[PDB]
Design a protein around this ligand. Structure first.
Ligand SMILES: [Cl-]
Ligand SMILES: [Cl-]
Ligand SMILES: [Pt+2]
Ligand SMILES: [Pt+2]
Length: 129
């Protein structure tokens, strides 16, 4: 599913990503935009034989398992395909653990390069929340 910008923001709000670990909702919307372009089915492989999954591009080296990646630990205790669903609950839950893992949102490359330090408030404009 391809989300609308405020549509995704509403869902993220409900699951409480707004201001989670000190990151305002706009950060999380911006992250999703530049990681997956609001597409829950987005998948991208990188050169360590692993794939980033879903709306927030969670990597299978540590967080989820595809049976495809070496030395995978699956710290979110969930198949990587659960992060592909139209329902973002699986991704948000796992994301909360990731952002708490001693790096904040720096775990997400696209966020660090295209969202961090910017007026993230813009990503929730026009939204009724
Ligand atoms: Cl919850
Ligand atoms: Cl809305
Ligand atoms: Pt809306
Ligand atoms: Pt939730």
């Amino acid at each position: 599913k391809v989300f609308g910008r405020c549509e995704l923001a509403a869902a993220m709000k409900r699951h409480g990503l707004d201001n989670y670990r000190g990151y305002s909702l706009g950060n999380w919307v911006c992250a999703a935009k530049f990681e997956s372009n609001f597409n829950t089915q987005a998948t991208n492989r990188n050169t360590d034989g692993s794939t980033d999954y879903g709306i927030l591009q969670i990597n299978s080296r540590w967080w989820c398992n595809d049976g495809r990646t070496p030395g995978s630990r699956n710290l979110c205790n969930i198949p990587c395909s659960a992060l592909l669903s139209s329902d973002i609950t699986a991704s948000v839950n796992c994301a909360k653990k990731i952002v708490s893992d001693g790096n904040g949102m720096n775990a997400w490359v696209a966020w660090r390069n295209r969202c961090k330090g910017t007026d993230v408030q813009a990503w929730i404009r026009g939204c009724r929340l």
